[PDB]
């Protein structure tokens, strides 16, 4: 239903995209015979001999042609910006189920593939409407307001889309209990798998992604530490995002907590975010995205009240992506929690 309509708009942008590619690909040559005629008629100083009237009409209808191609460029600007503005709530709602049900897709990988291919392609095409007048511009046309107004609007459009298109698929979890996420003992494995889910890449170099943990120690208790005694990154050559996709799993990494409040062991907060140095077509833009609130344990009995804590916010926390939890939540009406534990041991046996 939804997928075929939005793919129909991916067909629309392919169609009008290639048609406008054609119209530029002829207007450059109409510019070329114009600069020849002016170039050699200007040569030769050896009235109104109709060469003035012809080159008048050549300038005039070249001018009108430039007006029309910018007008259809506006007609696809409104269309693809409506494509983006409707494209975003699918991303955040499927984010909402996507880590609503982690208690124990590539459609959008393709759509960010074609999305950024069309935006960067229209960008790079729009970068040289300059040189269709940088030979000789010489007219009071729409020539600068188009290239830089529309360059600017699509520049902030793909920078907001790059701003909100780097998410996480896989929450951290135990290697020992692969069914209980959001819980890592001091020394457990950072069982995560994210992705640069926008499938464009400069083929220049093998790029890396940095972690970033706990930007702000809050008012309540800036907790002790942990030092990741395993590494913090991997390296993706451009040949493998073309092969497997831009997968970023920082799994199996382990920590060491340093040494030397009514919230306790399973009530402390450590949110890890991820520094991404992203650049394509020269457009440099840094990306960072946080994670779900994860608790840290030290003992097997903390699994019980940790997991009751896990339901105790995962149904009981609107605007949940924040620091310093547990303080004043409301209690649990079990209207879905009953179905949730029903998923648990009625998933197990009867």
């Amino acid at each position: 239903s939804q997928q075929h309509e939005i793919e129909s708009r991916i067909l629309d942008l392919r169609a009008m995209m290639e048609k406008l590619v054609k119209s530029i690909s002829q207007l450059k040559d109409q510019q070329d015979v114009f600069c020849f005629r002016y170039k050699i008629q200007a040569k030769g100083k050896t009235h109104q001999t109709k060469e003035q009237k012809i080159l008048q009409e050549t300038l005039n209808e070249l001018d009108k042609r430039r007006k029309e191609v910018l007008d259809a460029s506006k007609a696809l600007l409104g269309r693809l910006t409506t494509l983006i503005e409707l494209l975003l709530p699918k991303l955040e709602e499927w984010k909402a189920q996507q880590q609503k049900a982690c208690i124990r897709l590539e459609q959008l990988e393709t759509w960010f593939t074609a999305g950024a291919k069309l935006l960067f392609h229209l960008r790079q095409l729009l970068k040289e409407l300059k040189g269709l007048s940088c030979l000789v511009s010489y007219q009071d046309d729409p020539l600068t307001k188009g290239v830089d107004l529309r360059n600017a609007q699509v520049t902030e459009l793909l920078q907001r889309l790059l701003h909100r298109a780097f998410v996480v698929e896989t929450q951290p979890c135990m290697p020992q209990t692969p069914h209980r996420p959001l819980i890592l003992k001091t020394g457990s494995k950072f069982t995560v798998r994210t992705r640069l889910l926008v499938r464009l890449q400069e083929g220049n170099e093998s790029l890396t992604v940095e972690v970033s943990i706990d930007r702000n120690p809050p008012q309540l208790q800036g907790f002790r530490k942990f030092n990741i005694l395993t590494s913090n990154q991997k390296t993706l050559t451009p040949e493998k995002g073309q092969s497997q996709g831009l997968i970023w799993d920082f799994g199996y990494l382990t920590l060491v907590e340093q040494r030397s409040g009514p919230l306790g062991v399973t009530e402390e907060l450590h949110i890890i975010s991820f520094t991404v140095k992203y650049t394509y077509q020269g457009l440099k833009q840094e990306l960072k995205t946080d994670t779900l609130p994860v608790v840290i344990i030290s003992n097997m009995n903390q699994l019980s009240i940790a997991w009751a804590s896990v339901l105790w916010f995962n149904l009981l926390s609107p605007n949940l992506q924040n620091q310093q939890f547990f303080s004043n939540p409301p209690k649990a009406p079990w209207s879905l929690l009953g179905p949730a534990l029903s998923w648990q041991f009625s998933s197990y046996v009867g």
Binding site: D29, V33, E51, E57, T58, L59, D63, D140, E156
Partner: protein, 881 residues
Amino acid sequence: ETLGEKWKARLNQMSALEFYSYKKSGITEVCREEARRALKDGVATGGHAVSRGSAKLRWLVERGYLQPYGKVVDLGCGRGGWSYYAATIRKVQEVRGYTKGGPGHEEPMLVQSYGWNIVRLKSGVDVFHMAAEPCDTLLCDIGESSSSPEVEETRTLRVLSMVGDWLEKRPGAFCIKVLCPYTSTMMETMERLQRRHGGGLVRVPLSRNSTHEMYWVSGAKSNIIKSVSTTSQLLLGRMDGPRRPVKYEEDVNLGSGTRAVASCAEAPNMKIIGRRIERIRNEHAETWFLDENHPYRTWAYHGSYEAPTQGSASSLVNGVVRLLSKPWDVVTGVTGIAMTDTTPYGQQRVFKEKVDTRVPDPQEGTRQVMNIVSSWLWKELGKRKRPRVCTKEEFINKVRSNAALGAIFEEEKEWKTAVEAVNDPRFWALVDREREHHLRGECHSCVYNMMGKREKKQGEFGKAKGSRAIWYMWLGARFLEFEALGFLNEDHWMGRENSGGGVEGLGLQRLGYILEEMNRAPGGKMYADDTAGWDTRISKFDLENEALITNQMEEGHRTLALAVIKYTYQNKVVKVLRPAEGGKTVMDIISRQDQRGSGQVVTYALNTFTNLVVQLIRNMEAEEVLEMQDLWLLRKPEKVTRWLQSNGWDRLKRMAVSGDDCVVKPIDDRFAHALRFLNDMGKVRKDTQEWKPSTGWSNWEEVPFCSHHFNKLYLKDGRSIVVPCRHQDELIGRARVSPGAGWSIRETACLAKSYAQMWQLLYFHRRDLRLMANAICSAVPVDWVPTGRTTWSIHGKGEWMTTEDMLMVWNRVWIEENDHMEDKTPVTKWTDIPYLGKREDLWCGSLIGHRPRTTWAENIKDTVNMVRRIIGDEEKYMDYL
């Protein structure tokens, strides 16, 4: 300190999607995506312009703040849709549309919406320097936006200077646009014309968001600071908040037609028309009616009736030379002469533009000048020979070769083409019935029907009669033309060896020798006046003057020829297609005593006659034999019979005239300013005002006439060859056109080969048309026969229509039958025939040395192998390298 400044504080200092997202948010729009694509297709109906603010005048004028009337002057017209909406008002009597145009602006367009005759929409004129003129309703709509707001306050000050200096008539009402109406300076500017002339401000409800345009209309009688203060509260009331979405609204429509106007018509003589009116009217009496909305001001409307769909502006493209020529797609000249029209829109618009033109009758002293040099001129050629007749078998065999191919009838045997239509007996019978009529005095079968073909670059874009309106008489009365008068067409009765003035009969290959031995005259330069609107400007006392050949004819021959010039020239009728409501192209019938046609074959006699008259008259003013004190009664017939019988033949020894054209060379330079008398007759010029003296050419190798500048070339032998020429674009775009009868692959192939041969003969010296030419010679089969019709002048010999090897044909016309070439030693290789010079051809529109031409000029056999696939490979071809 004001309120509207923070549009330009916030909206300046903030981002792009807030401006774009705000700019469409919460504003009243009107649905327009249809006609932006519907009137793009080309429909001249829809009752609404491709504009925006016609809804603004809809809201305002319907709202009652404005009630225009009488004469209306528009300003900053753009697309002019303001004026189109103004046309619908049932008090408007004339609208002048005046605007700038030029590059970086928006040229007008010509949609036949309702009220079509009453527009006068003129581009070009800049109103920085325009004299103030009276009206009854005044409008202005020039508005540009800036960052710092005083920069556009400056423009508001200029335009209030322009309207404030304009409105000094004390007219009735107005509707003036104001850019920035939140200054005290505008209130001081306004309050004078409020205490005097009133009105005030109304915010247009359907303006865009991010501009504060308000219209000083002549209606808003408020205390102005209450109004400005109120809408200036609605400025910040409509400033920000949430993205309040778009309101839509239905678009304006009225329909089409043409509003009835006053008429300067002349009462005709109904006793030479009326039985044809009884023929069509008594033929179509149920469909017959009288449109009161006739757009007929100088002509004579006499009723109407309905009509079928006929005619088409869909004359397609030759695909062949399209598929042979790469860079002659990118230039707009080759597309500039693509498609003319025969549609009723086109006929009505060429009609309005340059047909319905009343002329003032010149003085009687000039009429005696006409009768003296006229009757002198007839008796001058009457001394040499006498009139004769001509016969039918001459006309069958004459139409066998090429003559006109004009296949449209009016009587009931409506067939395909004339060349079979000659093979009937019955049209001889009814032709002889009209000979019984005209030979007794009645007439039933002299009814013109024109088509209006004009040569437009792109549709509906500003051109009035770039090609002339062409009238059609039915073939049978074209034969009565032929037998009646067409001997002058036949036996050279105005050729150079008989009349001494005009070089018709000769083609277009020897004319440059005729001016080049006009080079040996003393005195003047090449004086090559051209005349704007020839056939439009021939008055009644020119063709009343023309009947003096009746003094020389045989008796019954005088009855038939005098009869037919009474029946088709002294009076005439046309029926005329006109678009109207619902696509019902209701066709009228129309009359005028006074103009000539353009399709009849005896018209060479009248025009080349008529301008040899007028330019003997101009040359005898150029010898100062006449003066401007000789206009009213007379001074001396003996001065002009003396100037003739000593001078006149010797003067017209030295000029060349065919059709309306002229090229003269007097012995003085006084000819350039002999202009008064001529404007009394009313034969105005082109690209020179009404009294400005003309411009000569001391050089002769580029003087223009019949759309050709002529060059002379020298051989490797050293042989003086005068060649014709014209600018490359306007011929290579003639082979691009397809007429509408070349439906096959074979018809377009042979017609394209006809262009190949014609260019191979005359236009060899350029680099381009040779490679084009022998290229498409290799493409079309050697087995085939080129037919068709390239040119349209009378100078088309039809010489290059043979299937013969073209070396022989060049060698014939351009060695053998040349008197003007002496040593007739024959050519061997036209490959070793050299060229015109490089830069001079570059003056004439070449693109040698350019990258495209060089590239596909390095691979051509493939390019013709494309079409040798596209046409069958069971043919016979030839190398051309």
